[PDB]
């Protein structure tokens, strides 16, 4: 009741679990509609699971954890943001602001009443995360390298130049498990990938 | 975030009690240091456009005394021009508290090196010598003018810095800090009602 | 005392001006002014411009309205300070009052 | 306890007792028992001990006076502070110098087992007077503190080293010359300015 | 207590009442005698009585809402005002928060200790509310601000005497005031102000 965690109830629960999805009205509130707090949820058994992943998916596994350091990253950011405006800040953290805010928007939303993502199997996921690190890692490395240079690549030069790569890899998202062949999909983010890659050293 | 995570309790009560008197001490102040601060903008813009018709007919009359002169001597352009070594005037930069910023503001110094005396041309130096006196003057009302613009640049952007300072005190801190308040509040007087619950309790079992 | 005044102006200006003692030549033997006529170009002006930017011996900067007028994108990019650039008009030719640098930062006014 | 300053037992011992020293807002620094609050610090025998102090020392009054001045003053602004003027800087560090060094004893340590009178007389004055020798304006009477930092960091840290001048080894004629001589150096650096 | 209005009193009064007549301290220190912070203020019968008004005091209807208009614009006047100074004001601007004024010190404030504004009889005071709204509208659509427009300095200069005989409308005192007298005497002062926009 009352929406905190302050009832000996939830307190009590908290004491005996080993895993803890916290939700947040405020994102319900969004239309965010899988609202996951990931900065209060934890799970405990991240240990004697890294073996799957090993022998299924081990590309996974620095993956996942790139991905929760951004998301950190971006909160770490965000009030310093909030009390203080743009136009003081590095290009290498705004960049991470706004992917992160792609992260935001798309991976973690989840709409599971739309006839297409009633459902997401374990490799899409992987995969659509891949394609996201690497995007982000391929276009921070880009813009480090010419830190120095006599032509900074900033954040609009990015957009100007991938804007349209950008919005395919929002609608990235719309891949039925059904309907449409696991090696189709696959195929597809393969070669959405060696698009970004195209268009990066292009630049 | 909506709240600042802290434990109810009186002290709780105490050092938020304590934190939201600064922040509208520091508010105030703010507020107050901007007004100041818009005043002396004000007062600056006063001012620019007298100096700047001021200006004008100064700078007017001055270049009809050279039209005068070119009537005098003829091309005392070509050799003027040609003779540039050394200026005898120089500007120093110092600068100006006006408030808590500090403000860039220039002075007029002269050197006094020798100045080109030209006589060659039909002995001109009569019209020289007052055009020596009607450009000396527009350049140190220039001098002045620059001075007041340098200011004015640097008093706007230290003024706008202020503003969000203010807003930003305004707009998030005191709401955040006043519902903590709030929730300190409730909390403490749900708990001093159980415990008038179990006292009562115990007290009617006493009566077996 | 610290540094040295520039202007950019027709023959009439600079020829006013170096009477007043307003020039230099550096170490290098380059004046800190450029007379500029139906003969001299646009992006010669900007460039000189920006020299006189690099050069750290300025301070101010006389431009004549005709020149601002060729170069307006220059000098409203340069929003700095350093260069204390105020505008100056011709002759021959009306007193330039709009498409001041400072007017514009005023909206209260007329 | 928990509740620092609502708990029936520090209220009912503070209706009777005359003399109460208590900390303040739990510090960080955990360590640091020589904390005082002023919100309910007190004693009620400074009348009493004029006529035994007047025959004595009377210089400590007016220096006590400005200590709890300047103790309030930091006081005040930190709020601000936290969220300048000369004046403003010269009194905060002097302020963070008498909390660091005056205040915050170990207890046990060779050089606070027991501060007499005269130490702590020839610490307050010394650290009074750096005070009041830059306070007064922007000049040495009516520069930056920056530039007052950088010539006196020497002068400095032998403020805060007063403290380690054991009274059990060092006699106090050898530690009141100490005190004289560094006297003597604050005056001649804060002359040549 | 100490103006907190979480006061469980103080909500529970506040939702069955339907009528707040508010008051502040700072007004009375400006010596409001009638010190009513119409800001705060606000009444919810104002459908109730549309139809005694109706039937009596037909115009007295449209008065009122204008009159609450001018004080939610003379609100926001006074801020931009503070924002910059009345300098940058319109014409319009500064017609409006000079009837504020003059609505202000005359239609607001009361001095109950004088026989001739002790008491309202509820027809001396609609024809001044008339005669302030009749000048208000005059102001807007009779005048060329509604090519080159007319300064209210102007108009100022035309007739200040008869702004200031619509100011020295409260001094009338209907014990020795005939009702007919003073309603001919607001006509009377209605004609001077259509005589008034006649000649200009």
Not at chain 1, 10 to 20: D, E, R, W, Y
Not at chain 3, 60 to 80: F, G, P, S, T
């Amino acid at each position: 009741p009352g929406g905190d965690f302050s009832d000996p109830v939830t307190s009590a629960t908290l004491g005996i679990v080993q895993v803890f999805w916290g939700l947040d009205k405020k994102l319900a509130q969004r239309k965010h509609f899988p609202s996951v707090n990931w900065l209060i949820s934890y799970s405990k058994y991240m240990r004697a699971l890294d073996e799957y992943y090993d022998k299924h998916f081990t590309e996974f596994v620095p993956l996942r954890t790139k991905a929760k350091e951004i998301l950190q990253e971006e909160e770490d950011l965000a009030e310093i943001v909030q009390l203080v405006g743009k136009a003081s800040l590095a290009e290498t953290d705004k960049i991470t602001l706004e992917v992160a805010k792609l992260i935001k928007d798309d991976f973690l939303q989840q709409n599971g009443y739309t006839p297409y993502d009633r459902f997401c199997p374990f490799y899409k996921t992987v995969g659509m995360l891949s394609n996201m690190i690497s995007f982000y890692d391929m276009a921070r490395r880009a813009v480090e390298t010419t830190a120095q240079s006599d032509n900074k690549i900033t954040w609009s030069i990015i957009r100007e130049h991938m804007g349209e790569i950008l919005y395919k890899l929002s609608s990235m998202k719309f891949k039925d498990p059904v309907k449409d062949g696991e090696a189709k999909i696959k195929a597809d983010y393969a070669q959405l990938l060696e698009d970004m890659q195209n268009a990066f050293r292009s630049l | 975030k909506d709240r600042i995570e802290i434990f109810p309790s009186r002290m709780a009560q105490t050092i938020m009690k304590a934190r939201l008197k600064g922040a509208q001490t520091g508010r105030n102040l703010l507020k107050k240091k901007s007004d100041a601060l818009t005043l002396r903008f004000r007062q600056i813009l006063k001012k620019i456009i007298e100096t700047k018709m001021l200006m004008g007919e100064v700078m007017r009359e001055a270049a009809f005394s050279l039209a005068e002169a070119k009537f005098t001597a003829g091309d005392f352009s070509t050799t003027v021009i040609q003779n540039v070594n050394k200026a005898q005037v120089k500007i120093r930069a110092k600068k100006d508290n006006v408030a808590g910023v500090t403000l860039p503001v220039f002075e007029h110094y002269h050197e006094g090196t020798d100045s080109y005396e030209l006589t060659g041309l039909a002995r001109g130096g009569e019209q020289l010598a007052k055009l020596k006196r009607n450009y000396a003057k527009a350049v140190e009302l220039l001098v002045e003018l620059a001075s007041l613009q340098t200011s004015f640049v640097t008093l706007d952007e230290a003024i706008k810095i202020t503003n969000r300072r203010v807003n930003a005190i305004e707009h998030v801190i005191i709401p955040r800090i006043e519902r903590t308040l709030a929730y300190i509040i409730t909390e403490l007087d749900e708990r001093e009602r159980e415990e008038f619950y179990r006292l009562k309790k115990i007290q009617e079992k006493k009566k077996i | 005392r610290g540094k040295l005044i520039a202007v950019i102006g027709d023959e009439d200006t600079v020829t006013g001006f170096l009477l007043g003692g307003i020039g230099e030549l550096n170490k290098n033997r380059h004046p800190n002014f450029l007379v500029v006529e139906k003969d001299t170009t646009i992006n010669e002006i900007e460039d000189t411009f920006r020299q006189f930017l690099n050069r750290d011996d300025i301070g101010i900067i006389l431009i004549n309205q005709y020149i601002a007028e060729m170069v307006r994108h220059a000098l409203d990019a340069h929003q700095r300070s350093i260069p204390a650039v105020l505008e100056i008009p011709s002759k021959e030719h009306p007193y330039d009052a709009a498409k001041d640098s400072i007017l514009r930062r005023a909206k209260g006014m007329f």
